[model samples]
Target chain A: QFDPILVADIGGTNARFALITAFDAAKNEFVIEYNHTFPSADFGSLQNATRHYLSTVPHIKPVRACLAVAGPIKAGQVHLTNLGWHFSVSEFKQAFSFLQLEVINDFAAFAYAAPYLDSNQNVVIKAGQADENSNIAVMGPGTGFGAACLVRTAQSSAVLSSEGGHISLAAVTDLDAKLLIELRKEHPHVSLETVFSGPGIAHLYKAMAAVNGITAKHLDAAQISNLANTGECEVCDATLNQFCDWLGSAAGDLALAYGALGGLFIGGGILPRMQSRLLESRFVERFSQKGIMSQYNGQVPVTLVTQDNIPLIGAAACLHNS
Target chain B: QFDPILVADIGGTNARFALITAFDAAKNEFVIEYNHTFPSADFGSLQNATRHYLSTVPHIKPVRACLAVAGPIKAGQVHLTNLGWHFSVSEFKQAFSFLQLEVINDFAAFAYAAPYLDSNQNVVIKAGQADENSNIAVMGPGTGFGAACLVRTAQSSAVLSSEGGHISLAAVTDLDAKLLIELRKEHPHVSLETVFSGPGIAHLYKAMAAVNGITAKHLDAAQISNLANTGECEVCDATLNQFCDWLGSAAGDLALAYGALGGLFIGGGILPRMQSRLLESRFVERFSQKGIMSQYNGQVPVTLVTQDNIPLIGAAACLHNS
Candidate 1:
């Protein structure tokens, strides 16, 4: 169990901060004090967001903290240049007068959370026996594509950080092949993020509409998902279906790559919102869609995490163990 | 250093056994005794092969031994059903009167050997600075496509087992896309093994020939490589080119997936045979083919292990510490 710790999951759009007030023994979960969400645009730096959050909860100042940031952590410092958020660990520790501060990749934090999630926080996509001590592939698409492998060998375990989203996405069907072809026009190398991410939704929708010779509305991923949910647009529905299909295919690919007999976890900002659609889509079938390795893939468990503060919990978990 | 451990790398066709007689401190490598290679067909079972080897090396008997096999190790037993070989660890140890014995995945053994390899045993694929204590992506097209990640973190490190060859393979060019389309007719799921393994060479050659409306000779991977080396077959040359390209692509993908910032290592039986062709191929360029993530991929150091006894060394390395 972790001592009282400050946790944050910082992304491009949102900066979420929380405190682990207590550990519920019965529930096997951290009692997260309160989640304070802030748009990244409002804060100029990570320090600003941390300072602002600390000011609100002055009475509950925690010495230890783990901030899960969206970009790479270099030299104990984080720089998400696109988001204009930057922070150095030593500097932050000195400024905050903290005992310990851990700044990790957001997905790594997410990977740490996978083993701790209960039934309520996760919705099963593919039901299969997950071996107790095997590798689990942790991946999903949010602002960017975040992927990592949770390796649990008997003696030692570690999260193998990944840029899996940037790997070239594959085409299974003729329709998908066409989508890749279409996506290739704008982006020469159509990466997994091109088809399996939040922004990937719009790219997919546009490609689907273009391939069908249909008019494509300039819609965001959320707008397209809503339209598709209600069956208002044919292209949107097709795009969503394709996204689910690719999601399964991508998960299967990752599972095969990692030999993730432990399980496959789908974690992202996109999946939770479209969970209903995911349950109805071809996600399950496509997940085990390997030819000779089909049976091997079919046995791997798949799950969608519904809990929001997983990275926050994960960061706390990181500090607890290390 | 190990106490003169016996090490073996067992493949489908061949079983290689060796004795680590001494450690070369100056060279920083295990001084392996004479290697004994046997045809798998000659042995009735793993025990039979081991018995034969032990009989020959009766004078230089080792108490501790590690056998790295082609298939999964389950419940202290390894069953390579394809090769009709099976062994139980306790049975083997008892039969041989050994104090300790380890049966592990061949690729895992290969992963253990990565960090210790010297320049003589390795060919640089991409030149880049490898950061200390970062993850390394270890993969190659061999008897089967063997893949694993060498994770070296500050506190601890472990090799992440992977069946990466089974992941869905992708295409970057129109020619590659047509090859994939052709491949899909026979196999619904065209995995990374379809383009990146020893067997994948023939599959890719046939697919390439089909796309070009040319006659594809029923040639094995070695035959095709030989033909291409002599410039005897246009299709074979194209196939080899395509194989190298996809190899780079797949390696890039795995590197991204594993966040292998430390290095990318290519290890297999086949690459050592076609070292010349690999140097000439578009392997390096294709490795960093990810669109936005191209820069990240480019920075990762890539090396091809030309050493023959790496897996043997790896198995020994496994027992050296743990």
Candidate 2:
């Protein structure tokens, strides 16, 4: 029999791969063959990474393949947003000598993963009220912020690839707008992705420290998050608080745009680490603060994907239909 | 067989009706039966308005109906935002005794009519880049602002009934932000709907006049628009100019939300009336001003829907489908 379909989620820093055997609908589980993770920069290209990983394992039969790459899908070519790797279906197919190949934006794959997630697979972040069959949106923050929406139709689901993270952020409250005006000096455009992502979290701390005439410590997202949780750094605490608030506001904007009554799934690398902090912060309020739709959004629940390999599961599900 | 299906475009203040036999994809024309307009509030409910119009027309065989109301659809009832008329699908089905009936948000109906529009049906309000089959969003200004999105699936097109107009309106430039902040004092939660609809236009003139410290005559939406067009009042001109800018920003935001490559359709009772004014203003620039997604939004075409009886045609299309 042909080897199970290979599904991979490729990010700027790392690439993860898995094999799909079958779907367990009752348990909502993806039966898998094996899993592997490889650093991206070390490997010159995805082909090398895939080949190296496969070489270490048992010889497998050929089948169709799908990948979630960190870039837009255009005329079959994907120019990686952060890395130098550029690929197309034809090129990958030629390299692998495969019959079928598929590629989608990494965030888009995350969106496809949302529906099949179970309680054990995720953590609740900022939860509000929600309605079923409404649009569900997923946004993740890693090297850069990316967004996508899963729209439920009568027939099936359609994934909307969005540059929504690039939408200009608006400050709603007095203090928030005032802070935003201050942020304008550093960032005239104030793209939500600029403030909500990894670099954005650090940038927020630096910007706030600048106002206080205090030099900020060089801290990565993890360090800052750790300090904030321990209540060791005032600036770090403020940054996490503001991140949650801004994320809430961004979520509200997205919910209103998509009418995301189904629910809001918070994915990406950062949120899983800060889930508890985010849930305790003003995130839920910001998510539900839409003017007239507040009543509607207030009912929408917000959850975080905690599973180790959700995108793989999603890609497997997608391949099932194809 | 019958006198053609009756299609009604029900809005806040008025009920516009038309009759159409079928959609000719070749000619892209709405084969008209008979068209008439009536004040919605004059009648107790939608059925009364329908009955009044049907009573005046000559009857034949089977009567099929589709009514596009300016409200969200629940199970069966619609409490129209503008008019006091309550519409119940069951009520209409009983009163008209129609063989088939379907109802959708007015803006959603307009989206369904997009592929059928021909040159005679619309005039170019502002030309922008458009992609065919990409998600398309349509918003119209009437009693209130109505918004919807068109998404294509594997097999068919789906219309998203949205309350996007109620989403909070944010300012892009310094001047726009100042205006939004200024409006915030009077209206705590100023939405795009509040600023883009009939009341929104009137409110803009008043708010701008107040900000400029000038006393202006109390004018309706039409008077302010006329004054702005004739260059009779600076306040009116500024208000109208701001209206165009805000409308553009809102449309661009919607385009990004949908990744709307197909095009974003701008349909409303007001835009056609002020086509010359909108085209000459900063509408295009503002519409393309999404910071990082600027190129994407810039590529999506923004067109004005100028058809005489589009909702009716859309309703008729719905009748055909049902």
Candidate 3:
């Protein structure tokens, strides 16, 4: 009998879990038996969330589990940057004696799932021929900036987890330079996370407003996104556009650093909400703006992953690959 | 008896070649039978340089060659970014008739050589425990800015070649922001290469002079380095200091982007010459300045590769591994 596997994708706001009953190695397919979502804040720890999920689905039992966390994982411990949940694999092993568990950075899961992503699951932003010998990148603005690189070798594939979102954001245009100058006054180190995440959108809105000498209402990322889509606020619209363009620059930079010629897959909670805006934004332009390397970068494809359960799938991928 | 392999490290100024007769897998050691250096400008192409080197060492009959070129390598052709000569592997193979030739980015060669670098060959800029499971990075400013990542997996290792030096340069300090603003006036796309290469040093010297409202003497990168060391010019000294700080920022950003926890090895033609100055520069401070991930970055070690023939060594490595 095939062993049942538990998988989870934990972020700032929610924790999604599922059980993979089967995987077909021949066709590279996975079948999920059950899936559930829980509010991360409602639970005190990952242990509670796992217990709650298991209690609800009592008939099914998984022999092993892989949890994808939205923060750095070191020495088998992870403290979520945006959420209060702290995870320890040793403690989890102690509590669940029968099951083996592993905790990995969320972006690592994203990287693991990249090779399995289909054309339907992603929207191609900049089309280019895929070079299978090269690496692939999976990055997105979520509660924070998350990124990972998947290196393809003749023998196998490996995921290099990254804190790329925290790299300093580069200003390519005059407006961007001005915006960066303005933002620097408030914060000495203006990283990509400063204006590329959920809070980054809000920060960009205020910075753009200040630059234009207009008063802007303080809005969260979701509200700003909604207003921009409805054409309710000019500043909000501008913020979304700026986010995409800056993201384009960041993605291009990542592609170059990782030599991700296989493709660039955009995954995160925020990008999906701003999909249409991103398609129209300067993301493509910025992604292709690498001076002498512009021609090389222009040939590297960029895509936005629309799939919601990627982390779960990715976690299962790790389990299977291991 | 093993067949000898030819290895060359070709940059804008010089093309260095070597012959390796043996490699010990158990100890990861290579025996170079002979080596030579050729002025790249004096040669018409890499093939010409190889032909000259082989003619001088008439006794060596190599069956394969791995060339590390200081430029973009694509579609079997490489155009040296800073030099006039271009290289094509197919042409080289046809001319030689008996040799299989492969040309890779010089930074890729550096990446291939990182795991094998000893402490004697590298000066530690920052000290941290190395994580064996993490990816390693090699980056520096030479004739041009170059970077690469080496990912080690259970099954194999892969080198990720990067055009990272072309990613937009980020401005962290007020002076840096001002420099970026000034640089943007001349070029719309102010990338890391704008102020992070040999030509970048000269550009920084001019930009800093302009910002300080002082006229600057026209100087090349060598002239600026000499003036800075001799304290002959304040603007030149300022340029060198700024260059080191900016390089620190770029390296830190690359480390984050690639999650290079294995360690960062500095490899280039310029940095070794300015070693004493780099020890006193703000490079280390800027390298660890990620807002939230500062602690994580602080734990990642940084080192300067002091070996003069790393690319030559790396090329031999490729020849052996292949």
lDDT of 3: 0.80
Off by over 4 Å in 3: A1-67, A76-103, A153-157, A227-232, A316-322, B1-33, B36-103, B153-156, B215-217, B229-232, B316-322
Order of the predicted models by TM-score, top scorer first: 1, 2, 3
Residues A65-101 of candidate 2: C-alpha lDDT, one tens digit per residue: 8887766566777777576677767888889877877
* iRMS per model in Å: 1.3, 2.9, 2.4
lDDT of 2 by residue, B1-322 (tens): 3347888887656778777865566796668776888777788767678777877776633378788876667667777756766667887787778877788766768877776676665766556556664777788877687777777532235666556677777777777777777778778777787789888888787778877888768898889977766889879988888888778887887777776787878887788887887888888888788776777877887788886777876776656754
- Under CAPRI classification, how is model 3 graded? acceptable
Query: On residues A248-313, what C-alpha lDDT tens digit does candidate 3 reach at each position?
Result: 988888888777888888888788878788899999988988888788788898888887788887
Query: What TM value does the first chain of each candidate achieve?
Result: 0.89, 0.87, 0.87
Q: Select the stronger candidate by lDDT from 1 and 3.
A: 1
Best by TM-score: 1
DockQ of each: 0.67, 0.37, 0.47
- Candidate 3, residues B1-322, lDDT tens digits: the string is 7678888887657778888888766656677767777678887766777787898888877888888887766677777757777756787777887556667777778877787665576788888778887888888887778888887643246677767788888888889988877777676677888888888888888889889888878999999988877889888998899998888888898888888889998878788888888889999999998888888789899998887777877777666666
Tens-place lDDT per residue, model 1, A109-152, is 87777777776758999897998788888888886787887787
Top DockQ model = 1
